[PDB]
Write an enzyme that holds these catalytic residues in place. Structure first.
Site, PDB file in Angstrom:
ATOM      1  N   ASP A  49       0.814  -1.210   0.000  1.00 14.24           N
ATOM      2  CA  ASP A  49       0.000   0.000   0.000  1.00 14.24           C
ATOM      3  C   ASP A  49       0.847   1.260   0.000  1.00 14.24           C
ATOM      4  O   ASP A  49       0.441   2.254  -0.613  1.00 14.24           O
ATOM      5  CB  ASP A  49      -0.955   0.033   1.209  1.00 14.24           C
ATOM      6  CG  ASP A  49      -2.158  -0.891   1.034  1.00 14.24           C
ATOM      7  OD1 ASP A  49      -2.322  -1.522  -0.031  1.00 14.24           O
ATOM      8  OD2 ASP A  49      -2.946  -0.907   1.998  1.00 14.24           O
ATOM      9  N   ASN A  94      -4.593  -2.223  -4.235  1.00 12.13           N
ATOM     10  CA  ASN A  94      -5.905  -2.253  -3.547  1.00 12.13           C
ATOM     11  C   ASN A  94      -5.767  -1.391  -2.301  1.00 12.13           C
ATOM     12  O   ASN A  94      -6.325  -1.688  -1.241  1.00 12.13           O
ATOM     13  CB  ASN A  94      -6.297  -3.666  -3.134  1.00 12.13           C
ATOM     14  CG  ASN A  94      -7.776  -3.786  -2.774  1.00 12.13           C
ATOM     15  OD1 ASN A  94      -8.583  -2.884  -3.043  1.00 12.13           O
ATOM     16  ND2 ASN A  94      -8.147  -4.916  -2.163  1.00 12.13           N
ATOM     17  N   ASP A 313     -10.382  -3.246  11.858  1.00 11.41           N
ATOM     18  CA  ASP A 313      -9.282  -4.068  11.315  1.00 11.41           C
ATOM     19  C   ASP A 313      -8.734  -5.019  12.374  1.00 11.41           C
ATOM     20  O   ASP A 313      -8.681  -6.236  12.165  1.00 11.41           O
ATOM     21  CB  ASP A 313      -8.162  -3.174  10.779  1.00 11.41           C
ATOM     22  CG  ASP A 313      -8.567  -2.336   9.570  1.00 11.41           C
ATOM     23  OD1 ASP A 313      -7.724  -1.531   9.145  1.00 11.41           O
ATOM     24  OD2 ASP A 313      -9.695  -2.471   9.058  1.00 11.41           O
ATOM     25  N   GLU A 341     -10.679  -5.525   1.674  1.00  4.30           N
ATOM     26  CA  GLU A 341      -9.860  -6.339   0.767  1.00  4.30           C
ATOM     27  C   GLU A 341     -10.606  -7.509   0.155  1.00  4.30           C
ATOM     28  O   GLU A 341     -10.285  -7.936  -0.968  1.00  4.30           O
ATOM     29  CB  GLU A 341      -8.575  -6.818   1.450  1.00  4.30           C
ATOM     30  CG  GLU A 341      -7.534  -5.671   1.619  1.00  4.30           C
ATOM     31  CD  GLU A 341      -7.761  -4.720   2.826  1.00  4.30           C
ATOM     32  OE1 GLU A 341      -8.911  -4.588   3.341  1.00  4.30           O
ATOM     33  OE2 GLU A 341      -6.768  -4.056   3.201  1.00  4.30           O
ATOM     34  N   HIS A 385      -4.348  -9.702   3.236  1.00  3.14           N
ATOM     35  CA  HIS A 385      -3.294  -9.812   4.267  1.00  3.14           C
ATOM     36  C   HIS A 385      -3.824 -10.242   5.646  1.00  3.14           C
ATOM     37  O   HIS A 385      -3.201 -11.090   6.303  1.00  3.14           O
ATOM     38  CB  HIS A 385      -2.561  -8.432   4.420  1.00  3.14           C
ATOM     39  CG  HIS A 385      -3.463  -7.243   4.694  1.00  3.14           C
ATOM     40  ND1 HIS A 385      -3.100  -6.237   5.573  1.00  3.14           N
ATOM     41  CD2 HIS A 385      -4.654  -6.867   4.169  1.00  3.14           C
ATOM     42  CE1 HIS A 385      -4.031  -5.298   5.580  1.00  3.14           C
ATOM     43  NE2 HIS A 385      -4.990  -5.652   4.743  1.00  3.14           N
ATOM     44  N   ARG A 386      -4.969  -9.682   6.071  1.00  8.23           N
ATOM     45  CA  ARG A 386      -5.417 -10.016   7.421  1.00  8.23           C
ATOM     46  C   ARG A 386      -6.033 -11.385   7.535  1.00  8.23           C
ATOM     47  O   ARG A 386      -6.026 -11.963   8.634  1.00  8.23           O
ATOM     48  CB  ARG A 386      -6.368  -8.953   7.988  1.00  8.23           C
ATOM     49  CG  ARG A 386      -5.647  -7.587   8.132  1.00  8.23           C
ATOM     50  CD  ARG A 386      -6.362  -6.667   9.193  1.00  8.23           C
ATOM     51  NE  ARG A 386      -5.854  -5.302   8.974  1.00  8.23           N
ATOM     52  CZ  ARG A 386      -4.605  -4.899   9.218  1.00  8.23           C
ATOM     53  NH1 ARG A 386      -3.746  -5.625   9.953  1.00  8.23           N
ATOM     54  NH2 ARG A 386      -4.263  -3.662   8.818  1.00  8.23           N
ATOM     55  N   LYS A 411       0.608  -6.641   1.758  1.00 10.66           N
ATOM     56  CA  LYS A 411      -0.160  -5.414   1.630  1.00 10.66           C
ATOM     57  C   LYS A 411       0.212  -4.425   2.751  1.00 10.66           C
ATOM     58  O   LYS A 411       0.328  -3.212   2.485  1.00 10.66           O
ATOM     59  CB  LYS A 411      -1.670  -5.680   1.642  1.00 10.66           C
ATOM     60  CG  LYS A 411      -2.484  -4.440   1.199  1.00 10.66           C
ATOM     61  CD  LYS A 411      -3.965  -4.780   0.969  1.00 10.66           C
ATOM     62  CE  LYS A 411      -4.758  -3.617   0.374  1.00 10.66           C
ATOM     63  NZ  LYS A 411      -5.117  -2.599   1.414  1.00 10.66           N
TER      64      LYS A 411
END
Ligand SMILES: O=C(O)C1=C[C@@H](OP(=O)(O)O)[C@@H](O)[C@H](O)C1
Ligand SMILES: O=C(O)C[NH2+]CP(=O)(O)O
EC number: 2.5.1.19
Length: 427
Positions: A49, A94, A313, A341, A385-386, A411
């Site tokens: 990012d 993204n 998040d 995402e 990613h998460r 990311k």
């Protein structure tokens, strides 16, 4: 398809020096580019990012240098709005923290720029921001689906009375706040109704103040901005460690510690995700706060039922920690997990069931009842990613877990697995 398999982790203990905050990093880069003077950013995050924001600044003609590890950046400010013509295409991956802020900022003056990104970004909403920018004078065209990138920006935002919907993303308001000070006329930003992810607005106002600009916040319902201002370099600026990246390590100690300390964030941090530690404490873990660290020590782990709108998040980390807690956990008021995402309510429910949990996927909440014992699963990560980072916690049990496309963590956190391994102990 790449994959990584994590062996059971018997205990976690140690110290992690956190990578830089993505939220702070991308705001600091854009404001440094708009400002007058040279800004030196340290502890900048090197992740996809941030790389997309750096590449966009390069394409717009901004000059800067990066240190060998890409965490120190010396930026020569442009001394005003950034410009390009010829429908120059900026590819933003993204990264919402590049797409939303640049969509607004590049509406200043004249321009002819196209913002685009990965396929999923063309499915993430931006209409509320476009509607507000047009009320202020901007000319914006949707090149594909109405209300979504890609956008062709032709400039014209002068200020005035602007309404903005804050119910789907706080990023639309953030983008307007960073842009309006440089518009020629004063701007009054009125929030239509609800405002989600409110703590991120505080991060935006903090960074704007660091770069020399303040505005009038009327109880987060209306923001009065004086036009004709200029951002100014703060000189050397230290980017906070990422509190969302910290969540995995603090949660790992709450499940299987040991004591895990993360450095780079502390009690004075501006990020709302430091409040994730409060959730672990409510679940039964012990938390210690310092000026430049937060640590978590294993206590017990009981289920919670909480509105997580203030930490959307880091809240994903509680969804997998819930597999280890006593009782049924419910995370509420997290609708916008669906527009990030991936649709995270669908993805989290789907993958949690694969390891044995009983899960109710609500419209804007998730209820998780852990199994007596976890089973092995190959976890799909949805270019998110998460999802990779949250499911890595499954290995703090007696079963290994296989994570598909582990590099998706880049990311925001390229070195995630090596950092988790650093605190993983066999005894
Ligand atoms: O402004 C920011 O830095 C961010 C705001 C949040 O988005 P929403 O406001 O859409 O929840 C968060 O999910 C994102 O990762 C970072
Ligand atoms: O980091 C996250 O969990 C969600 N990010 C959404 P984005 O920053 O791309 O808007």
């Amino acid at each position: 398809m790449e994959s990584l398999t994590l062996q059971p982790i018997a205990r976690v203990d140690g110290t992690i020096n956190l990578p830089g905050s993505k939220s702070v990093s991308n705001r600091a880069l854009l404001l440094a580019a708009l400002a007058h003077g040279k800004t030196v950013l340290t502890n900048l995050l090197d992740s996809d990012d941030v790389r997309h924001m750096l590449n966009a600044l390069t394409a717009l003609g901004v000059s800067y240098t990066l240190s060998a590890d890409r965490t120190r950046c010396e930026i020569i400010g442009n001394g005003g709005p950034l410009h390009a013509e010829g429908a120059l295409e900026l590819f933003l991956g993204n990264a919402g923290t590049a797409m939303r802020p640049l969509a607004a900022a590049l509406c200043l003056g004249s321009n002819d720029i196209v913002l685009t990104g990965e396929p999923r970004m063309k499915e993430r909403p931006i209409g509320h921001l476009v509607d507000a920018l047009r009320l202020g004078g901007a000319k914006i065209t949707y090149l594909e689906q109405e209300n979504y990138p890609p956008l062709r920006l032709q400039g014209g935002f002068t200020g005035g009375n602007v309404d903005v919907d804050g119910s789907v993303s706080s990023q639309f308001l953030t983008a307007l706040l960073m842009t309006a000070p440089l518009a020629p006329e004063d701007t009054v930003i009125r929030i239509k109704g609800d405002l989600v992810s409110k703590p991120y607005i505080d991060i935006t106002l903090n960074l704007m103040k660091t770069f020399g600009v303040e505005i009038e916040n009327q109880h987060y319902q209306q923001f009065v901005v004086k036009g004709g201002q200029s951002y100014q370099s703060p000189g050397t600026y230290l980017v906070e460690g990422d509190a969302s990246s910290a969540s995995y390590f603090l949660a790992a100690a709450a499940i299987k510690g040991g004591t895990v300390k993360v450095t780079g964030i502390g009690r004075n941090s501006m990020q709302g995700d430091i409040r994730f530690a409060d959730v672990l404490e409510k679940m039964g873990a012990t938390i210690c706060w310092g000026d430049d660290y937060i640590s978590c020590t294993r206590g017990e782990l009981n289920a919670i039922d909480m509105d997580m709108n203030h930490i959307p998040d880091a809240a994903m980390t509680i969804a997998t920690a819930a597999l280890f807690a006593k009782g049924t956990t419910t995370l509420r008021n997290i609708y916008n997990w669906r527009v990030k995402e991936t649709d995270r309510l669908f993805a989290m429910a789907t993958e949690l069931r694969k390891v044995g949990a009983e899960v109710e996927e609500g419209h804007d909440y998730i209820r998780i009842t852990p199994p007596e014992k976890l089973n092995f699963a190959e976890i799909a990560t949805y270019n998110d990613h998460r999802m990779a980072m949250c499911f890595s916690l499954v290995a703090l049990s007696d079963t290994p877990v296989t994570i598909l496309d582990p590099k998706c963590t880049a990311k925001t956190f390229p070195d995630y697995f090596e950092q988790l391994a650093r605190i993983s102990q066999a005894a």
